[PDB]
Amino acid sequence: MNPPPPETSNPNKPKRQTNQLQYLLRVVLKTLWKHQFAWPFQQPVDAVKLNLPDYYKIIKTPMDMGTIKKRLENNYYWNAQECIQDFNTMFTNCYIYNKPGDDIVLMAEALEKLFLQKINELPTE
Numbered sequence: 001m002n003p004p005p006p007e008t009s010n011p012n013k014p015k016r017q018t019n020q021l022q023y024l025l026r027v028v029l030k031t032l033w034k035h036q037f038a039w040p041f042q043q044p045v046d047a048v049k050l051n052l053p054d055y056y057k058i059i060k061t062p063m064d065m066g067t068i069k070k071r072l073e074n075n076y077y078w079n080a081q082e083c084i085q086d087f088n089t090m091f092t093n094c095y096i097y098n099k100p101g102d103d104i105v106l107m108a109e110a111l112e113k114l115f116l117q118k119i120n121e122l123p124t125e
């Protein structure tokens with residue numbers, strides 16, 4: 001069973017645009033998206049499709065790059081750090097749901113290193 005995907009809009013929450021958030025969409029996300037290991041992370045885990053009936057029994061704060069992309073596109077975030085926390089939740093979720101050395105974990109580890117490389121330096125505001 002799949003819960004609804006994480007919100008990508010919320011009228012109670014204030015919106016913002018910053019140079020750093022623009023960069024997170026235009027450079028960081030859009031480059032990671034093209035990586036050969038990006039595909040498992042491009043949309044919410046579909047537990048019915050993937051036959052992972054325990055996925056949402058284990059993972060209570062799901063996150064994926066599709067959701068992050070839509071959040072950036074909709075100016076959902078207040079700042080870069082908020083967006084960065086979503087990437088970090090995505091990676092951590094993968095390590096939590098799986099086991100060290102798993103192929104899916106190797107993919108997340110590779111993406112995380114590339115992500116860290118790209119956010120090491122952000123534009124100034």
Ligand SMILES: O=c1[nH]c(-c2cccc(NS(=O)(=O)c3cccs3)c2)cs1
Pocket residue numbers: 039040041045050093094097098103104105107
């Ligand atoms: O913890 C997470 N698993 C996934 C995911 C996405 C697509 C397919 C799978 N299962 S899978 O096809 O057996 C697989 C194993 C290694 C990479 S994908 C997991 C995303 S986040």
